[PDB]
Design a protein around this ligand. Structure first.
Ligand SMILES: C[C@@H]1N[C@H](CNC(=O)c2cccc3c2C(=O)c2ccccc2-3)[C@@H](O)[C@H](O)[C@@H]1O
Ligand SMILES: N[C@@H](Cc1ccc(O)cc1)C(=O)O
Length: 438
């Protein structure tokens, strides 16, 4: 056991009502919106294939010239109530919003920098408007915050000199200032999700990551903080030197997921995955034809996969520069919402079931020890194999959307065939199981 001043603060999972709400929510939306939405991946007549929110980097745009995009920031179609309605209809229980991305442009009118929505033609507090509108629909709001900031020259990727140390200290104070500000202006914030924390400068300043977490928890009672922020005394990131999760939940499953057989370790801690609809675009990119674009069922599969392994999933949207959503995103939100309305009982407030993974889909476990079978792959055999842990029996099976009774047949020791339904539900569907221990 290695002694640490700034290692993990939680032992096991938090179970206060704030964390249980964070967990029960399960399905989130991500909003990446900033100046990058104006060029939409194109600069000086070249369309760049990389992620649009990184266009400053791909097109090698100097800060002062990138930040002039502010003179074109005028999202006249923006209506926060309509954004919140689109979220509510999708079934999203929370939204994670880029308060500021790597570019450093702020969606709220910060007093600590001029690179904010206040100094645009639109002028309005986009963030405040969203927080209110989402909250009025019953949707929790989480703040994405990039520590790395391309707009502040005091930022340093590493500390290799007295000059570096002096500058980066000014940068941490500035960061501190923005964080206190966000927490005090928007006290309904439920989470801060730090990103752009990978540089050696943050690793050397692990003390600060611990301070930021503690500062925010005092200012916002119950607030969640992600593991990405954190490094310990030894410079060890995410999980401390004693193997313990730092922050409140693990956050490294970005555009990927743990394996349902090999990675059951993730069930021991809270965690949240995120994903894009195209292969790798968070902010608005004008041309989605340049990579593969996931269909709604492919996205739902990923959502259910996360919940089946005790994790949340956050699906990204990159709104247009005019304040509206592209057609592909509207279609996606609508399709997810249609599905969650019918089958969300197997997602919201659900968790890892402890059953061996089967080919037809995923198990999830409800608050009242219900076990849901979520079927993505329909067997031609008309039989869904269920292997139970030792000492566990299956008693009933019911179609979730029709109440229709479902045959259960014992096939061997600890194994059942659960019949499918008489009519193919025709999309991924859900069977609830009653189970009994010894
Ligand atoms: C949500 C997205 N986060 C990006 C930065 N993070 C990464 O690209 C990333 C991708 C996969 C895994 C990780 C990361 C990442 O930083 C990170 C830190 C610690 C553990 C795992 C990861 C940003 O660069 C993107 O613009 C977008 O905001
Ligand atoms: N573990 C529960 C039974 C159970 C097991 C797995 C489940 O997915 C649900 C319920 C008990 O001790 O009674």
């Amino acid at each position: 056991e290695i002694p640490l001043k700034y290692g993990a603060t939680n032992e096991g999972k938090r179970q206060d009502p704030a964390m249980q709400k964070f967990r029960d929510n399960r399905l989130g939306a991500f909003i990446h919106w900033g100046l990058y939405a104006i060029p939409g991946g194109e600069w000086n007549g070249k369309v760049y294939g990389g992620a649009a929110e990184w266009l400053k980097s791909w097109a090698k745009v100097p800060a002062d010239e990138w930040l002039k995009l502010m003179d074109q920031w005028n999202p006249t179609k923006f209506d926060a109530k309509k954004w919140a309605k689109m979220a509510k209809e999708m079934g999203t229980k929370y939204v994670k919003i880029t308060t500021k991305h790597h570019e450093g442009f702020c969606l709220w009118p910060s007093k600590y920098t001029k690179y904010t929505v206040a100094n645009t033609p639109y002028k309005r507090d986009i963030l405040g408007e969203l927080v209110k509108a989402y909250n009025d629909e019953g949707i929790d709001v989480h703040f994405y915050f990039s520590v790395m900031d391309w707009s502040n020259p005091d930022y340093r990727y590493d500390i290799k000199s007295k000059e570096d140390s002096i500058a980066f200290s000014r940068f941490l104070e500035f960061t501190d200032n923005q964080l206190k500000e966000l927490a005090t202006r928007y006290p309904t914030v439920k989470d801060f999700w730090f990103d752009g924390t990978w540089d050696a400068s943050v690793k050397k300043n692990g003390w600060w990551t611990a301070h930021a977490e503690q500062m925010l928890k005092e200012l916002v009672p119950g607030v969640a903080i992600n593991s990405r922020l954190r490094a310990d005394d030894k410079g060890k990131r995410h999980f401390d030197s004693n193997g313990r999760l730092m922050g409140d939940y693990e956050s490294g499953y970005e555009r990927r997921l743990p394996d349902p057989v090999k990675d059951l370790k993730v069930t021991q801690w809270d965690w949240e995955a995120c994903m894009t609809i195209p292969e790798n675009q968070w902010g608005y990119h004008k041309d989605w034809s340049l990579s593969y674009v996931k269909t709604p069922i492919e996205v739902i599969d990923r959502i259910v996969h996360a919940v089946s392994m005790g994790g949340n999933m956050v699906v990204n949207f990159g709104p247009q520069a005019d304040g509206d959503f592209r057609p592909e995103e509207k279609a996606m939100a609508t399709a997810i919402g249609k599905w969650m309305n019918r089958y969300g009982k197997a997602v919201y407030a659900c968790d890892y079931a402890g059953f061996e993974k089967q080919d037809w889909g995923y198990y999830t476990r409800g608050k009242n020890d219900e076990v849901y079978m979520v079927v993505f792959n329909q067997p031609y055999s008309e039989r869904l194999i269920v292997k139970t842990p030792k000492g566990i029996t299956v008693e009933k099976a019911t179609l979730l959307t029709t109440g229709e009774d479902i045959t259960v047949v014992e096939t061997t020791r600890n194994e059942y065939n659960v019949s499918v339904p008489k009519k193919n539900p025709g999309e991924p569907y859900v069977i609830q199981l009653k189970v009994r221990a010894a």
